[PDB]
Design a protein around this ligand. Structure first.
Ligand SMILES: O=C(O)C(=O)Cc1ccccc1
Ligand SMILES: [Co+2]
Ligand SMILES: [Co+2]
Ligand SMILES: [Fe+3]
Ligand SMILES: [Fe+3]
Length: 224
């Protein structure tokens, strides 16, 4: 209805969560899904836990030793992702001298079955550009597609559209305008958006440089 009301739906205001061990997170929520961007300090353990929600994790900057179930893997920035199905224990250590920036999606929606690869970690692959100039890379599982998109500056654009797939995402680069229904927000590093099925959305990068985004489809839209 109103601007504020749409903004709070589609571009929820984040809360900052701080842990005793020094991890800070920015949490944004719409209904069945939470996006959490975490800053994990050098040489820090993230204690293992487990929960009924599924969790998808990816590193955006730095390098993170991640453990899902009994699989431990080194996660490289923008080249790694895993799914921890409901109740599978997971934890991590930033074993480096550098901060780690990560994103987690935590989700529990009716009528979704949360499969994962047998060893949890997904394999990235390129495809042809989504639109010319807009390079994308994906991880895909039966119920979720993760699309990393580089939107060029100087008017790189995703035309305004809708689809039945739910689509949630986060700017992980400089910035661009994103619009959902009646609300346009200037995306910054970390800004999350949530589109329910059929809500119209599009984006335009008017800055002078490319911006990156992680865009996640429930269920897959491109690699079905
Ligand atoms: O492919 C789609 O459905 C999209 O919405 C893609 C997208 C990519 C980058 C910014 C906004 C939307
Ligand atoms: Co978790
Ligand atoms: Co879309
Ligand atoms: Fe939802
Ligand atoms: Fe320009």
């Amino acid at each position: 209805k109103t601007k504020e009301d749409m903004q709070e739906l589609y571009f929820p205001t984040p809360k900052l969560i701080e842990w005793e061990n020094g991890v800070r997170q920015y949490s944004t929520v719409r209904g069945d899904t939470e996006v959490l961007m975490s800053y994990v300090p050098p040489h820090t353990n993230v204690e293992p836990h487990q929960h009924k929600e599924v969790q998808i994790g990816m590193v955006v900057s730095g390098e993170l030793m991640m453990t899902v179930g009994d699989v431990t893997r080194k996660m490289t920035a923008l080249e790694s992702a895993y799914i921890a199905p409901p109740h599978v224990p997971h934890g991590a250590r930033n074993d480096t001298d550098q901060e780690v920036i990560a994103i987690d999606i935590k989700r529990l929606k009716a009528d979704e079955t949360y499969t994962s690869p047998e060893d949890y970690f997904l394999d990235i692959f390129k495809t042809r550009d989504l639109l010319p100039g807009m390079e994308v890379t994906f991880f895909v599982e039966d119920w979720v597609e993760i699309m990393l998109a580089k939107i060029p500056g100087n008017g790189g654009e995703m035309p305004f559209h809708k689809h039945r797939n739910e689509q949630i995402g986060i700017c992980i680069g400089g910035g661009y305008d994103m619009t959902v229904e009646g609300c346009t927000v200037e995306m910054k590093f970390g800004t999350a958006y949530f589109c329910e099925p059929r809500e119209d959305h599009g984006a335009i990068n008017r800055s002078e440089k490319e911006s990156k985004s992680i865009n996640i489809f429930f269920p897959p839209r491109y690699n079905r």
